[PDB]
Scaffold this active site. Structure first.
Site, PDB file in Angstrom:
ATOM      1  N   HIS A  56       0.781  11.196  -5.831  1.00  0.00           N
ATOM      2  CA  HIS A  56       1.186   9.822  -6.044  1.00  0.00           C
ATOM      3  C   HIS A  56       1.045   9.392  -7.535  1.00  0.00           C
ATOM      4  O   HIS A  56       1.981   8.825  -8.126  1.00  0.00           O
ATOM      5  CB  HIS A  56       0.337   8.934  -5.103  1.00  0.00           C
ATOM      6  CG  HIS A  56       0.681   7.470  -5.162  1.00  0.00           C
ATOM      7  ND1 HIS A  56       1.440   6.836  -4.196  1.00  0.00           N
ATOM      8  CD2 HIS A  56       0.336   6.504  -6.052  1.00  0.00           C
ATOM      9  CE1 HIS A  56       1.566   5.555  -4.495  1.00  0.00           C
ATOM     10  NE2 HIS A  56       0.916   5.330  -5.623  1.00  0.00           N
ATOM     11  N   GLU A  57      -0.119   9.671  -8.137  1.00  0.00           N
ATOM     12  CA  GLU A  57      -0.338   9.333  -9.533  1.00  0.00           C
ATOM     13  C   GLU A  57       0.545  10.170 -10.441  1.00  0.00           C
ATOM     14  O   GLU A  57       0.956   9.710 -11.509  1.00  0.00           O
ATOM     15  CB  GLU A  57      -1.786   9.493  -9.909  1.00  0.00           C
ATOM     16  CG  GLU A  57      -2.686   8.535  -9.178  1.00  0.00           C
ATOM     17  CD  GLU A  57      -2.116   7.131  -9.121  1.00  0.00           C
ATOM     18  OE1 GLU A  57      -1.411   6.642 -10.047  1.00  0.00           O
ATOM     19  OE2 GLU A  57      -2.341   6.494  -8.100  1.00  0.00           O
ATOM     20  N   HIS A 101       3.733   8.451 -10.347  1.00  0.00           N
ATOM     21  CA  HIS A 101       3.552   7.228 -11.159  1.00  0.00           C
ATOM     22  C   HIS A 101       3.773   7.527 -12.646  1.00  0.00           C
ATOM     23  O   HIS A 101       4.527   6.820 -13.312  1.00  0.00           O
ATOM     24  CB  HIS A 101       2.139   6.653 -10.886  1.00  0.00           C
ATOM     25  CG  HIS A 101       1.942   5.238 -11.325  1.00  0.00           C
ATOM     26  ND1 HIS A 101       0.728   4.602 -11.209  1.00  0.00           N
ATOM     27  CD2 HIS A 101       2.774   4.350 -11.925  1.00  0.00           C
ATOM     28  CE1 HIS A 101       0.824   3.375 -11.694  1.00  0.00           C
ATOM     29  NE2 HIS A 101       2.062   3.189 -12.118  1.00  0.00           N
ATOM     30  N   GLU A 125       5.065   1.116  -6.238  1.00  0.00           N
ATOM     31  CA  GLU A 125       4.176   1.726  -5.250  1.00  0.00           C
ATOM     32  C   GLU A 125       4.946   2.543  -4.190  1.00  0.00           C
ATOM     33  O   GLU A 125       4.581   3.699  -3.901  1.00  0.00           O
ATOM     34  CB  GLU A 125       3.367   0.616  -4.587  1.00  0.00           C
ATOM     35  CG  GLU A 125       1.910   0.875  -4.570  1.00  0.00           C
ATOM     36  CD  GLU A 125       1.540   1.604  -3.332  1.00  0.00           C
ATOM     37  OE1 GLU A 125       0.324   1.737  -3.047  1.00  0.00           O
ATOM     38  OE2 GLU A 125       2.481   2.023  -2.611  1.00  0.00           O
TER      39      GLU A 125
END
Length: 247
Positions: free
Chosen positions: A75-76, A79, A106
């Site tokens: 996820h990061e 991002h 998100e």
């Protein structure tokens, strides 16, 4: 298509490039693609992870289970990929702002994680070898090391024929409960969480007997409606993974 759909496609592309540049999608390998960016595992209370672009560091909460840590990390990474892409980031601003922009980002990060943990090729290879089945869902979860629901959505989203996927656990021949469910492309029929699964149903059978079943059966809609379909249930440690092939 829509702005949110173009953004998703783009996110899937970013995640695929970064992913394709690795030696597999194992955890340590995802870390290695990190082109000069620090990565730290430490306790962070209730927060799962954070990305700090100014310091060039990703933080992962060392207190959560390894499955969510692997996810939080994909996820990061997403991002960072998104924030590194100026065309994407600008088109987002063109369409959103304030908290609406935060929530969209998100969402994209989740779409990116998935693409990174579960590549289109690994899913297709499983669909080929195992067909659109509980067995495939079960393979994907293990080989991808992701939760049943992550796999459920990945799998159903790349399935051609009309199929319902379900993850069941013991409500406790004993009765199960649908925990999570998902349908392929064109199916509108959904099997909601909470839905009880009868003892006589092949899914209950497979679990309580720890024996992969496959046979013509019915979708046990909680309404009582008994829609016939081919069922392939793959039982495991306290879950059963099921596909319902609709004619």
């Amino acid at each position: 298509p829509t702005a949110l759909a173009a953004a998703k496609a783009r996110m899937r592309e970013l995640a695929a490039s970064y992913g394709a540049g690795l030696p597999g999608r194992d955890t340590h390998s995802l870390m290695h693609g990190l082109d000069g960016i620090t990565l730290t595992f430490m306790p962070m209370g209730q927060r799962d992870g954070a990305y700090d672009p100014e310091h060039h560091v990703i933080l992962i909460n060392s207190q959560v289970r390894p499955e969510r840590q692997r996810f939080t990390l994909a996820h990061e990474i997403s991002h960072a990929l998104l924030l590194g892409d100026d065309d994407l980031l600008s088109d987002l601003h063109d369409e959103y702002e304030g908290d609406r922009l935060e929530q969209v980002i998100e969402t994209l990060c989740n779409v990116g994680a998935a693409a990174l943990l579960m590549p289109a090729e690994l899913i297709d290879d499983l669909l080929t070898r195992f067909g659109p089945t509980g067995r495939a869902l079960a393979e994907l979860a293990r080989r991808a090391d992701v939760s049943a629901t992550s796999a459920l959505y990945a799998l159903a989203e790349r399935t051609a024929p009309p199929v319902i996927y379900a993850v069941c656990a013991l409500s406790r021949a004993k009765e199960l409960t649908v925990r999570a469910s998902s349908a392929s492309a064109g199916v509108k029929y959904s099997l909601s969480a909470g839905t009880p699964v009868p003892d006589d149903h092949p899914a209950a059978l497979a679990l309580d007997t720890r024996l992969p079943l496959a046979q013509d059966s019915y979708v046990p809609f909680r309404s009582g409606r008994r829609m016939p379909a081919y069922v392939d249930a793959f039982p495991e440690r306290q879950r059963v993974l099921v596909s319902f092939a609709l004619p």
